[PDB]
Amino acid sequence: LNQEWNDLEKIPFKCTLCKEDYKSPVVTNCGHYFCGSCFAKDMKKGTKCFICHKETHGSAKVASDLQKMLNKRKS
Amino acid sequence: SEKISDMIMVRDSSIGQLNLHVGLENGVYMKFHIGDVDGSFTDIKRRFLGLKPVSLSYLREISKWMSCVVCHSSSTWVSYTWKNVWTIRQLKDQNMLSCSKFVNADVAINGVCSISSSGRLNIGRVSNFPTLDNWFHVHEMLQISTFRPRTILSFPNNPKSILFIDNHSGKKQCRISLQIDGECLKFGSSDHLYKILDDIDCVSAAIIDFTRQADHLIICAGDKRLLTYKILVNKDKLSFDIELLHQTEIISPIHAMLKFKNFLLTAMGSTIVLYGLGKKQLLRRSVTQTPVSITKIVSMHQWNYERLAVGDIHESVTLFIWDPAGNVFIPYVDDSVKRHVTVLKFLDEATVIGADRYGNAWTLRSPPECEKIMSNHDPSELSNGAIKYPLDVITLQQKLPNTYDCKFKFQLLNHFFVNDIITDFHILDSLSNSDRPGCIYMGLQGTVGCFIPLLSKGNVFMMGNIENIMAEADDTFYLDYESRKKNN
Amino acid sequence: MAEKQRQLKLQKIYKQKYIGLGDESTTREQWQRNVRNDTLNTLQGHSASLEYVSLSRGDLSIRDTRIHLLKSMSPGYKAYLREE
Amino acid sequence: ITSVMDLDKLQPPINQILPTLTPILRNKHRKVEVNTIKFVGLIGKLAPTYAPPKEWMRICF
Amino acid sequence: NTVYVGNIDPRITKEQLYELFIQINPVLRIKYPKDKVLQAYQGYAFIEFYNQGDAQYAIKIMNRLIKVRQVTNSTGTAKLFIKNLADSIDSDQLVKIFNKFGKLPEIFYLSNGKLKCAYVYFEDFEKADLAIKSLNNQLVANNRITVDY
Amino acid sequence: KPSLSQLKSQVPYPQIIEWYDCDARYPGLLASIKCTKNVIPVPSHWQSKKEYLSGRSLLGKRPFELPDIIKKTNIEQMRSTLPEKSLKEASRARVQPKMGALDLDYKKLHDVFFKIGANWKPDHLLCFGDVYYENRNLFEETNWKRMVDHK
Amino acid sequence: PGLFMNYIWAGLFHPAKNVRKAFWRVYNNMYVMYQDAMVPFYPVTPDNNEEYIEELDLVL
Amino acid sequence: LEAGSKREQSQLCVATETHLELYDTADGELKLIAKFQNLFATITSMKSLDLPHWPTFLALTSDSGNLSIVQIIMHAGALRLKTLVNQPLTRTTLRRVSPISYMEIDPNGRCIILSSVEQNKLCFLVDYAQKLRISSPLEIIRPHMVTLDMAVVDVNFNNPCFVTLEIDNAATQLSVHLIFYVLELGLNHIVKKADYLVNPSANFVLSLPDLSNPFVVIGFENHILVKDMNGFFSLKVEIPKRSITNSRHKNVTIISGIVQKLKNDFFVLLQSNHGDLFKLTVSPDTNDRNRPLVQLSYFDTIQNSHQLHIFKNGYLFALSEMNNNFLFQFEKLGVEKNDFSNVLTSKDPNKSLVFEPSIKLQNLSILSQQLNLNPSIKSQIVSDSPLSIATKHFTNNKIITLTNAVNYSNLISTSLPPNATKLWLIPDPATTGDNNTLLFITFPKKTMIL
Amino acid sequence: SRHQFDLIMCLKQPGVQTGLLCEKCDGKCPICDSYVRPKRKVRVCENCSFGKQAKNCIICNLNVGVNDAFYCWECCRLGKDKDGCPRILNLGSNRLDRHFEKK
Ligand SMILES: [Zn+2]
Ligand SMILES: [Zn+2]
Ligand SMILES: [Zn+2]
Ligand SMILES: [Zn+2]
Ligand SMILES: [Zn+2]
C-alpha cells in the first residue's frame, strides 16, 4: 500500500566535500559526516546540509564514533 | 558571522541549564543552550542591540534569586530569564561601559556599581524587571486634584517636549503645565510649575508652528472662541512662558485640529476650514464643505501634506486630496459600513488604521484601481475635468447614487475586536531597535497593546497553526474525554 | 400549509424570548423603541461604553449614568426630567 | 472475533475470509447485509493489503 | 458623444468595433444592434465616446473598411511601411502601436487574413522618423518587425 | 398621502424615490432609510409576475466552463461530458472490473489547488452594491474588462 | 451584520406587504443571532426619529 | 497557600471583564498573589459563594450565557483557575433579555439568583456532594419590567428572599416600584410577596439584617427610606449635605452601602455621589415603643466606590470606580449615636443638616493603594527605543511615565580619571570576616585599585 | 425536525439533565439532524424529565434512549444550541400514518 495521492551503509566513507578520508570528523543534528575543514567551509556559502538541505545552524559535534566505525576495531 | 568580541558562560540554578552568552562585534548578541554531558550547541537565540562590539558582564539578583548578564553597547541590555522565558531589555541609564555587583550598607539588594560611558564611577540599584506578567513599570492622607486632565501635546520640532492641559471641575478654568526632558519647568520666575488660564476651558487644543522659528498654542473654548497663545522657553533658566495673542470666533465646537502645511487644519462640525496666521486674529485661508453624509468630524489625520483622512461620528471614514490651485479638498474614497471612529491614522499612504466607540480596531486599504489613477493624474482633475473612469464604475454611480458617490470604496483589510475603546494609536518606526515597525495603541480603561506586522508568509502560517491549536483546545480535551469514557 | 403554520408558532415563541422581532406590520413607533432599548442596553453593558458616556456627560458617578440609561428605557423619563 | 483478536494470528486467515464474503453481499435480507458490511469495512480499516485491488472494486459495485 | 456607425458586415463584432474606435479616444460603451431573438446583427452599431471631441474626431477620421465593407459613420440621431506582422495584428492593433509617435493606416489582408504588413501615414515626417528606429526591429507579438520609409 | 414632489424635497438623493414610495404606511421614514448612506435597494423583480427567473435570457445560457487553472489538470480530455455500452457489457464490468480509468496524476492535482493556483482568484467577482438582475449577463462584462486592458 | 444589513434595511418597511413580508423574515433571523451586534448599524438619525439617543453623539 | 493548614476569610479576588486577579490581606497590606490566564470573554458578574460543608469558589457569569462556578486551585507549580460547573443560559452576546449583569447569592450558599434587564430572572439552587451540583433553574418572567438594583436579603435559613427596583417599560408615566420575591423551598418556586410603588427617583436597595419581615434601605435622590415588606414601617431620613455645593450640583443619591455588624452593633456604611460616607444604625426607640429609629451621621469620606467590602478583620476595602483602589482599617468607628448635634433621626423626616467635609481623614487609615489607570484619555509616546509613554492620572492629576525598561536608580557617582575600560570586584581576602571588598579598574596603560 | 414539518419542539429553559438518543437515532444532532462533528451535550428541561418520558429518544420520543445527544459544530456556531429544550413532543404525521396502514 503506497499512496501517491497524499547492513545498509548510509555512511559514505570518502567525503562529500573532500571526497577523501574523514579527518577531524564532524557530526550534525543529522547523521551527516564531514571533516572539521569540510563543514566550516560549507557554511561560508550554504545555510544547510550539503545533502539534506536541512538546518545545521553551524552545529557540529566531534564525530569520534566515526573514527570508531572507521577503525577496524570500532570503539 | 563576524568575529566574537566577547563571551561568558553561566549556569542558572533553577533549570540547571548551562548557557553560553556570546557577544559579537557589530552589535549582534547571541546565547546558547549547552548540553552538560555531550557539549552540544542548541537553542540559538540572537538579537541586535545597538551598533558597537558588545562586551558582556554578569550579576546576581532577585525581582526569588536570579542571575542576568547585562550587555554594553550604545545602550545597556540586561538579558535575564524569568521562569522558562528569557527577555532582553534595556535600562533607563543611557549606557554603562562595565558593570559589577556591589553589596553595602546603606542596605543593598540588587545594588550594582558600574562605570558610565563618560568614564565615571557610580552606584545604582536595579529595581523593576519587565516580566511578561507586568512588562511596563510605572514611574513619576488622601490625594485628590480638582483639575481633571484633558489633553497632551508635543512640540513638532522639539522631538519630545510634552505639554499638558487640564480643566477645572467647577468654575471654568484651565491649567497648563509643560515638561521638557525629565522634569517639568517653572513658570517664568514664579514658584509655580504651572500656569492657570481663567475663563478658558479647552474642548480641544493643538500646538502649531505657523513659522519655523516659533511655536503657538491653540485652544477652543466651549464659548465658540478660538484662542492662540505663544510658547516661550527661556533656555536656559529654564522656564516656560505662555503669551496671549488673539481671540477668534467660530461656529462649531472644533473637536479636531492639526498641522497641515503652514496652517491649522481645523474641523468644524460639518466642514473643514484651513487657517493661517494673521495679525489681530487668525483668518480663513480655505474652506471645504463636506459630502452630505458627514455630520461631525471626530478626528482627522494626514499623510505628508498630500492627503487627509477624516473620520465621522457615525459614518465611517473618508480620504481627501489637497488640491492647490483649487484651494480645496476633493474626496476620492469612502467606506462601506457604518463605523464610529474615535481615532484614525495612516500606517501608509494608501492605508489607514482606526478604532470604534465599540471596541473594534480595523485597517482600511484603498483599492489599487484607485491607486493607478491617483498615481497617473494631477489632483485638479478629480473635481471637474477629464478622468477616464471604466465603464462599470460610472454605472454604479447611476445605479446607486447614495452608496458609491465618491466613487471607490476601501477594501477592509484587518478587523479585530478588543473590548476597550482605543484612544490613541502610535505608529512607531521600530521598538527597541526591532526591525518590524509596530503600532502601539492605548485604550480608555487603561491598556497598551500592539499590532505588529508579521513579515514572512512563513510565520503567519505557523502562528496561524498555533492559534488554531489553542483556540479549540477545550473542545479537543473534551472529545478525548468523551471517547475515552466510551471505550477504556 | 402545515409548514407555514409551524412558522407562526415559532414566531410567537421567539418574540417572547427576544422581545423585539418585527413581523410584517410593525408600527414605526413600535420598531423605533426596540432600536432605542438595545442601544441603551449596550451603552450601559460594556464597561468602556459606560465610562465614555459618563465622562462625556460629566456625570458625578459612573453609577448614576447607568441609571440615567435604564430610566430612559421608560417612555415617561422625558416627562420626569422636565418636572424636576 | 476479528476486531478483538490480532489479524496476523487469525486462523482462517483473512485473505481467505474476504473473498468468501463478497458473494454474501448479494444475499438480500438485512441481517446479512448489515452484519456483512460492518465486517467488510472492518477489513478495509485493519487489513487493506490482503485482497487485491480488483477485489475491492468488486465490492464497490 | 454618440455615433451611429452602419453598413457593417453582419459578422463585425463589438470587440472589433472597440479595437477600431478605441484609438480615437476612451470609449464609454459600444452596442451592435441585433435581432431580439435570432440575434442576427442589424448591420449597424452605436459607439459611445467619453469625450465628444473624440466622437467627433472618430467621425472625421475613421469614416474605413471592416470585413469587406465601408462603414458609414454619422452622429446618432510621412508614410512608413511595416513588415512581418503577427497576423493577430489588425488595423486597430496597428494604430494603437504607432499612434504614440504622433497623428497618423491599413494592415493589408487577403482571404487568408492579416497578410503580414501594412502602412501608416503620419501627418508629420518627424513623427515617421521617430516611428522608424524606435520600432524597426524590436519584437511585437513574438515577431520582429521591419519599419522603413 | 404626500405627493412625490413633496417627498422628494426631504431627501438628499431625490433620484431614488419613486411613485410607489408615496403609499408606504410610513413614507417619511422609508424615504429617509432608503436614502441612508449605504442602503442598497430591494431587488427590482418584485411586481413582476414572471417568477424572477423566466426564460428569454435563460434559453441561451452556456453549460459551464472550468476555470483555466483547473483545465490545466487535463480532466477535460479524460472524461468528455459534452454532449455506448450495451447493458450486457456494463454488467460484465461490475464483475471483472477494470482499473485505472482516469490515469490522472496525483501530484499535478494537488499543485493546481495549492502550489501553482495558490493565489488564483476569479477575474471579476462582484462589488458591494451589484445585485444580479434577471437579464444581466456576466460573460460580456468580464470580457469587456479583458478587452479594454489588452486594447 | 453590518455589511449584510445594508441589503436588508430598505425593504424592511416598503409599501408592498409582500416585499415587506419577505425582508422581515430575514431581519428576524438576524436579530436573534445578533441583538447587541446590530446596535452600531441601525439607520437612525436625530431627525429620522423623535427621541433618538442624545448620548450617541457625545465626544470626549 | 504556603500553609499546610490555614483558613482565614481575608483574601480577595478582583475581576474586570476579561482580566482577573487575586490579592491577599492579613499582612496589613494588599499583596498580589496570582494573575491568571487570559479569559477571552466578558465577565458580567462575580460573587463568591461560600457553601456549607471546603474552599470558596467564585461563581462567575459572563458573556456566553453560561453560569460558571470556578474554583481557583493549585496545580503544577502555579495557581490555575479551574472550572466546575458551567450551566447554559440563552445566547452569546451581552443582550438585554439574557440573565446576567445582576447576580446575587444567598448569603449562606443555598442558591444563586440571576436576572436580566427586562423579561426573565432565574434562580439556581446549589448543593454540595461528592461533586458540586446545581438544581434545574427556577424561573419567573415579568414581561415589560426593566430591572435596576437586585440587592438581596440575608435570612437565617428561613427561605431566601430578594428585593428589586423594577420600572415598567411600557407605561404613560415613569413609576419605579420596589418588589420583594421569596423563593419557597417547600413548594419550590419563586413567589412575589410584596409590591410597593415608590417615587420615581429611586436609585438603589440595600438589605438590613435582622432587627432582633425584612427591611430594606432605599436610596432616593436627596433622602433615604427604609421599608418593611409588610408595609408597616416607612421611615424617611433626609440625607445630609455639603456646605459649599460647588457649581453643578446634582440632587445627590447613594451609590454603595455595605452592612457590617458585630456585637449587637448594627451599623451600615452608605456612601453618596460626592464620595461622602455615612453610617446608619437602627435603634429600638425605647420611649415610643420598640420600633425603629434611623440615623444618618458622617464618616471620613473617600473617592467614589463602585462597591465596598469589609473583612472579618477591621480592614475595609473600597473598590474605586475612576481609579486607584484602596484598603482602609477603621479605628474610630464613627460618631456615637448620642449626639443630637450632628445626627439625624427618623423622628421627623423633614429637617436638614449641613456639614463641612473633613480632609483630615480621621476615622479611616490608608494602609494600602493599588495604582490603576482607569481612564486614560490621551497619551504620548516619548523615547521610542525604550518605549516610554507619557500620560496623566485622572483623579490625582499627576504625570505618569510608563516605560518598558529596567528601572536603574543612581546614587553617589564619583569622578574617575580618564579612559577606563573594564571593572572587577572581589570580596576582600585581607580582612576575613569583614565587609571590605576590593574594587579594581583598568586603563589601557594603567591599572587602579580601591 | 429539519425535514418533518409537523413536529413541535419544546423550547423551554434547559435544565441540568442530558437528552438521550435511541440506538437508531444515535449520532444525530437534534436540530439539523446531521451525523457529523459533535460539539456540546444537549440539555433538556425538567418538564421533559419526570417518569417514563425522560428515557425516550429526544427525537422520536418513542424508543428508549441510551447515548447522550450532542449539538453539531455548525449548530453551535449559529447559536441554535441555546434556543431551548430541543425535544420533540408530538409523534408526527409520518410515524402515525405508517403505523395505521401496517395495522
Ligand atoms: Zn573532508
Ligand atoms: Zn542533513
Ligand atoms: Zn430516536
Ligand atoms: Zn446541527
Ligand atoms: Zn422540554
From Swiss-Prot, chain C:
Domain of life per record: Eukaryota
InterPro entries attached to this UniProt entry: SF3b5/RDS3-10
One cellular component term from this protein's GO annotations in UniProt: U2 snRNP
Single Gene Ontology BP annotation: U2-type prespliceosome assembly
Stored Pfam families: SF3b10
Stretches of the chain forming a coiled coil according to its record: none
Main subcellular localisation: nucleus
Function summary: Involved in pre-mRNA splicing. Required for the SF3b integrity and prespliceosome assembly.
Subunit field text: Belongs to the SF3b complex composed of CUS1, HSH49, HSH155, RCP1, RDS3 and RSE1.
Stated name of the protein: RDS3 complex subunit 10
Species name: Saccharomyces cerevisiae (strain ATCC 204508 / S288c) (Baker's yeast)
UniProtKB/Swiss-Prot annotation, chain D:
Locations listed in the record: Nucleus
HEAT repeats (start-end): 12-49
Coiled-coil regions listed: none
Quaternary assembly: Belongs to the CWC complex (or CEF1-associated complex), a spliceosome sub-complex reminiscent of a late-stage spliceosome composed of the U2, U5 and U6 snRNAs and at least BUD13, BUD31, BRR2, CDC40, CEF1, CLF1, CUS1, CWC2, CWC15, CWC21, CWC22, CWC23, CWC24, CWC25, CWC27, ECM2, HSH155, IST3, ISY1, LEA1, MSL1, NTC20, PRP8, PRP9, PRP11, PRP19, PRP21, PRP22, PRP45, PRP46, SLU7, SMB1, SMD1, SMD2, SMD3, SMX2, SMX3, SNT309, SNU114, SPP2, SYF1, SYF2, RSE1 and YJU2. Interacts with RDS3.
Functional note: Contacts pre-mRNA on both sides of the branch site early in spliceosome assembly.
Other observations noted: Present with 521 molecules/cell in log phase SD medium.
Similarity section: Belongs to the SF3B1 family.
Protein name in the entry: U2 snRNP component HSH155
Lineage: Eukaryota, Fungi, Dikarya, Ascomycota, Saccharomycotina
Part of the whole protein covered: 669 to 729 of 971
Swiss-Prot record, chain F:
Subcellular location: Nucleus
Source species, domain of life: Eukaryota
Effect upon mutating E51K: In allele CUS1-54; cold-sensitive growth suppressor
Entry keyword annotation includes Nucleotide-binding: no
Keyword set includes Protein biosynthesis: no
GO CC term (a single one): precatalytic spliceosome
Gene Ontology biological process terms from the UniProt entry: mRNA splicing, via spliceosome; spliceosomal complex assembly; U2-type prespliceosome assembly
Main location: nucleus
Keywords noted in UniProt: mRNA processing, Nucleus, Phosphoprotein, RNA-binding
One example GO MF annotation: RNA binding
Note: Present with 1830 molecules/cell in log phase SD medium.
Family, similarity comment: To mammalian SAP 145. Some, to C.elegans ZK632.11.
Function recorded in the entry: Essential splicing protein required for U2 snRNP binding to pre-mRNA during spliceosome assembly.
Assembly and oligomerization: Belongs to the CWC complex (or CEF1-associated complex), a spliceosome sub-complex reminiscent of a late-stage spliceosome composed of the U2, U5 and U6 snRNAs and at least BUD13, BUD31, BRR2, CDC40, CEF1, CLF1, CUS1, CWC2, CWC15, CWC21, CWC22, CWC23, CWC24, CWC25, CWC27, ECM2, HSH155, IST3, ISY1, LEA1, MSL1, NTC20, PRP8, PRP9, PRP11, PRP19, PRP21, PRP22, PRP45, PRP46, SLU7, SMB1, SMD1, SMD2, SMD3, SMX2, SMX3, SNT309, SNU114, SPP2, SYF1, SYF2, RSE1 and YJU2. Interacts with RDS3.
Protein name per the record: Cold sensitive U2 snRNA suppressor 1
Organism: Saccharomyces cerevisiae (strain ATCC 204508 / S288c) (Baker's yeast)
UniProtKB/Swiss-Prot annotation, chain H:
Subunit text: Belongs to the SF3B complex, a U2 associated sub-complex of the spliceosome. The SF3B complex is composed of at least CUS1, HSH49, HSH155, RDS3 and RSE1.
Molecular functions (GO terms): U2 snRNA binding
Descriptive protein name: Pre-mRNA-splicing factor RSE1
Keyword Electron transport: no
Encoding gene, per UniProt annotation: RSE1
Keyword Aminoacyl-tRNA synthetase: no
Physiological role: Involved in G2/M transition. Required for pre-mRNA splicing and endoplasmic reticulum (ER) to Golgi secretion pathway. U2 snRNPs associated protein required for the pre-spliceosome assembly. The involvement in ER to Golgi secretion is probably indirect and due to the splicing of the pre-mRNA coding for SAR1, a small GTP-binding protein required for COPII vesicle formation from the ER.
GO CC term, one of those recorded: U2-type prespliceosome
Whole-protein residues included: 82 to 561 of 1361
Main location: nucleus
Family statement drawn from the similarity comment of this UniProt entry: Belongs to the RSE1 family.
